[PDB]
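assembly run, all chains below
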Amino acid sequence: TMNITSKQMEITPAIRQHVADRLAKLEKWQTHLINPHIILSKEPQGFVADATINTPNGVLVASGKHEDMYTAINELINKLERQLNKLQHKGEARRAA
Amino acid sequence: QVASGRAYIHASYNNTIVTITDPDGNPITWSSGGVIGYKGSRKGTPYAAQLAALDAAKKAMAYGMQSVDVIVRGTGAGREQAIRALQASGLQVKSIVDDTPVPHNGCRPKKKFR
Amino acid sequence: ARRRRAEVRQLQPDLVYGDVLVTAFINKIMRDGKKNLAARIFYDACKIIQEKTGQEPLKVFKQAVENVKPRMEVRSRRVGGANYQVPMEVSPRRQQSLALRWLVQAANQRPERRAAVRIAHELMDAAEGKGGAVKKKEDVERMAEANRAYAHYRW
Amino acid sequence: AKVKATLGEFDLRDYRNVEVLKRFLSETGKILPRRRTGLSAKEQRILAKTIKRARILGLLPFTEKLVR
RNA sequence: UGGGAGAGGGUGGUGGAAUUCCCGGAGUAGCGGUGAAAUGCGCAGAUACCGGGAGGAACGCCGAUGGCGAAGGCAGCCACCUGGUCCACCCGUGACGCUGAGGCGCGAAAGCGUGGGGAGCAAACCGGAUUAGAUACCCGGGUAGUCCACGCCCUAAACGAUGCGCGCUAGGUCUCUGGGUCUCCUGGGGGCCGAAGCUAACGCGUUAAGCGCGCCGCCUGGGGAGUACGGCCGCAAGGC
Ligand SMILES: [Mg+2]
Ligand SMILES: [Mg+2]
Ligand SMILES: [Mg+2]
Ligand SMILES: [Mg+2]
Ligand SMILES: [Mg+2]
Ligand SMILES: [Mg+2]
Ligand SMILES: [Mg+2]
Ligand SMILES: [Mg+2]
Ligand SMILES: [Mg+2]
Ligand SMILES: [Mg+2]
Ligand SMILES: [Mg+2]
Ligand SMILES: [Mg+2]
Ligand SMILES: [Mg+2]
Ligand SMILES: [Mg+2]
Ligand SMILES: [Mg+2]
Ligand SMILES: [Mg+2]
Ligand SMILES: [Mg+2]
Ligand SMILES: [Mg+2]
Ligand SMILES: [Mg+2]
Ligand SMILES: [Mg+2]
Ligand SMILES: [Mg+2]
Ligand SMILES: [Mg+2]
Ligand SMILES: [Mg+2]
Ligand SMILES: [Mg+2]
Ligand SMILES: [Mg+2]
Ligand SMILES: [Mg+2]
Ligand SMILES: [Mg+2]
Ligand SMILES: [Mg+2]
Ligand SMILES: [Mg+2]
Ligand SMILES: [Mg+2]
Ligand SMILES: [Mg+2]
Ligand SMILES: [Mg+2]
Ligand SMILES: [Mg+2]
Ligand SMILES: [Mg+2]
Ligand SMILES: [Mg+2]
Ligand SMILES: [Mg+2]
Ligand SMILES: [Mg+2]
Ligand SMILES: [Mg+2]
Ligand SMILES: [Mg+2]
Ligand SMILES: [Mg+2]
Ligand SMILES: [Mg+2]
Ligand SMILES: [Mg+2]
Ligand SMILES: [Mg+2]
Ligand SMILES: [Mg+2]
Ligand SMILES: [Mg+2]
Ligand SMILES: [Mg+2]
Ligand SMILES: [Mg+2]
Ligand SMILES: [Mg+2]
Ligand SMILES: [Mg+2]
Ligand SMILES: [Mg+2]
Ligand SMILES: [Mg+2]
Ligand SMILES: [Mg+2]
Ligand SMILES: [Mg+2]
Ligand SMILES: [Mg+2]
Ligand SMILES: [Mg+2]
Ligand SMILES: [Mg+2]
Ligand SMILES: [Mg+2]
Ligand SMILES: [Mg+2]
Ligand SMILES: [Mg+2]
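ok done. output:
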């Protein structure tokens, strides 16, 4: 299933559930999300949202950063999507010749 | 029964069609990438043309055909192999001519050819 | 590897028949580096096939090998947007490896309870042209012929 | 092996001289490039033009089948 | 005055290849299509092959780094009508010149109106694929339109992103087309590399983006915006 780590931070089950609903956007692509792992962390500048997810067509590794922990998470999701969309379609590029 | 006749090779990128005629140009038999059993892009392979040319030749000889004049149309991959297979069939291949249609700049082609 | 074509290991001829091919077969039988065990199993098998059919074990073994050698195989190649099963000739080195491999594997799918016996019998069937080993070879070949049309994609 | 060499004086403008003109046609009926006819730009221009007339009179082909 | 080259323009004719369709013949189990497929077509006889016919559009090779035009642009061949342009002679006129706000004309494609025409192609549209989805790309269809006449529209990466004219400032090399005395020389075009010089650089360099003069057009931070309002033009679209 899905693991979430809050490094040197406390978070709530609510917040954990939020992340799960946010990662859920990746379900769009109808591909297997294998051991998704989210790491939440606090720098002096803001929060950091890390993630490593493996799929049948490669790994997704992304880091999101922002003063607002939710935005940091949202940017993490944005970076993950762009990667997942490349993983899922890059092979189609060279179908001809 | 016809001893001599013609062999037409219609060879495109998608398929190779071979039709053996009489000397007037009327078909006695024919074969293709479909007849020898292939579907899809496989019909455009050289081997396909080979089986096709053979099956067409075999059928033709069964009507007594011995010599043929080979008329070739198209730039398909299975072209030369069809010509090959006709020679190596047991027919005389009295001649070989390419009669591929080419316009002197007629009709606007489909989008994919521009 | 990338730089050069690697060197085929020259094996040491076996003690009982003086045969590099036998040695190779032994190693393929050999699990966990227990070659003494491996050696016995084959030689025990060599005893058995003599009892069941009085001939030269060596002759049987070698005949079984020549019967499991695939002369043609398919190797995939994704051309364009599809993976074509391209028909290829097998190098004699590889013919050997596949033959000895399938022999042991098919042997160890058999129902009789002792290895030496399975190894014995499979070598007997493969010599006569029966058994799962030869079935593998026949199949691999049929796949290749089945895709003769793609034989121009050969590298 | 340039065609212009194989002939002496001829009329570049004579559309009836099938015998000379047919030299300047490939075996497939096409008009030959300068690199085969050895003609200058100016002479090739006249050659092409009178070849086309000869075709319209019926004396030269527009195209020919290629025998192998 | 005497010549030259050219897809310069307009009008009337006319040739062959190919596509499609229709007719006749012959023949059978598929054809077509794609990356792979499917839709589609086909035993109600398709595809492939032969003969006949109809019709529209575009002109293979020649063809080129080529030619012509002010620009847009111009390509089978014949004829008629007609423009620009170059050369040699150095014969005539005697500054008759340059530019050019307004004006006028021309102005690719798409589009519009009236009428014809319609083979191929193809916006819109319908279907098949592809894809997570695919109002696309690919595939099978498909109407305007694409073509002709006349009348409109007046835009563009309408580009050399480079206004026109004149004079001046190394050469090398390829090419088109004239005139020599024909080695080569000299005109007029079209390219390339480069003297000096220019340039922020890239680059330009006797086809200047160098050095000068004349006249015109134009710019004055990005967005808002080629928008609004007014006016003028247009059938509308929409243009200035
Ligand atoms: Mg577990
Ligand atoms: Mg967890
Ligand atoms: Mg803790
Ligand atoms: Mg916590
Ligand atoms: Mg990190
Ligand atoms: Mg998003
Ligand atoms: Mg990307
Ligand atoms: Mg096909
Ligand atoms: Mg094994
Ligand atoms: Mg096996
Ligand atoms: Mg058998
Ligand atoms: Mg004359
Ligand atoms: Mg004059
Ligand atoms: Mg019919
Ligand atoms: Mg016909
Ligand atoms: Mg050309
Ligand atoms: Mg040019
Ligand atoms: Mg010019
Ligand atoms: Mg004078
Ligand atoms: Mg005077
Ligand atoms: Mg004005
Ligand atoms: Mg216009
Ligand atoms: Mg128009
Ligand atoms: Mg229109
Ligand atoms: Mg209308
Ligand atoms: Mg109209
Ligand atoms: Mg109306
Ligand atoms: Mg109409
Ligand atoms: Mg129509
Ligand atoms: Mg659709
Ligand atoms: Mg769909
Ligand atoms: Mg949907
Ligand atoms: Mg569609
Ligand atoms: Mg379409
Ligand atoms: Mg269509
Ligand atoms: Mg409409
Ligand atoms: Mg209308
Ligand atoms: Mg309309
Ligand atoms: Mg008009
Ligand atoms: Mg204007
Ligand atoms: Mg241009
Ligand atoms: Mg200009
Ligand atoms: Mg401009
Ligand atoms: Mg001006
Ligand atoms: Mg001269
Ligand atoms: Mg000259
Ligand atoms: Mg010059
Ligand atoms: Mg330069
Ligand atoms: Mg300098
Ligand atoms: Mg300056
Ligand atoms: Mg000078
Ligand atoms: Mg110069
Ligand atoms: Mg100039
Ligand atoms: Mg400048
Ligand atoms: Mg501004
Ligand atoms: Mg406006
Ligand atoms: Mg506008
Ligand atoms: Mg207004
Ligand atoms: Mg303007």
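The helical segments of chain D are 18-21, 34-37, 41-57.

Chain D has one domain: 1-68.

not gonna interpret more than that til we talk
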